[PDB]
């Protein structure tokens, strides 16, 4: 598996470290005795003004199943609130805009 | 509870990347995270 | 905890006046003192 994480967060990849921005999209189950390697990327995948390249829903109901990937265009909810894109109190599209 | 707070510090995660400085939203994003498992 | 959140937005007003725009300084100062009467 590989995937995009921030330089001072890369730390938190470890058998039972939720989070926010390592948990909302990913988890790893318990049980993994294996190697992950990070790096700088910056040489070639970077750019100045902002990398409008990435995203992940910055809000979700509860955390990741064991290795769940599952997509979702649905807004995150405290109440029941039907938004489909207007900013609300609960509406709260998790989109979070990695530029 | 603090939906005041939530949705005002969501709007400063709006502007704060709509700064340039993309760097704090983030920190505030793991603060709400903070918020909601307390 | 409580006093870490507190804390916590103390840094944000803190960075935000860091970075520098009177606008959004004043809002969030405005948040703290609406969020410690609550």
């Given at each position: ?8 967060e890369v ?15 990913y988890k790893?189950?318990?049980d ?7 790096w ?10 902002g990398?409008?390249?990435?995203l992940?829903?910055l809000?979700?109901?509860?955390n ?9 265009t ?5 109440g ?14 998790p989109?979070?805009?990695y530029? | ?12 995660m709006?502007?704060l ?9 983030m ?8 918020f909601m498992?307390?």
């Open positions: 598996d590989s995937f995009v994480i921030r330089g001072d730390r938190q990849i470890a058998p039972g470290q939720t989070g926010k921005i390592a948990d909302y999209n790893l189950p318990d993994f005795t294996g190697c992950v390697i990070a700088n990327s910056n040489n070639l995948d970077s750019k100045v003004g990398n409008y390249n990435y992940y829903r809000f979700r109901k509860s990741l199943k064991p290795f769940e990937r599952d997509i979702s649905e807004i995150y909810q405290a029941s609130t039907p938004c489909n894109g207007v900013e609300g109190f609960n509406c709260y599209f989109l979070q805009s530029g | 509870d603090k939906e005041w707070i939530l949705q005002k510090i969501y709007e400063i709006r502007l990347d709509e700064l340039x400085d993309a760097e704090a939203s920190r505030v994003s793991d603060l709400i995270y903070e498992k307390k």
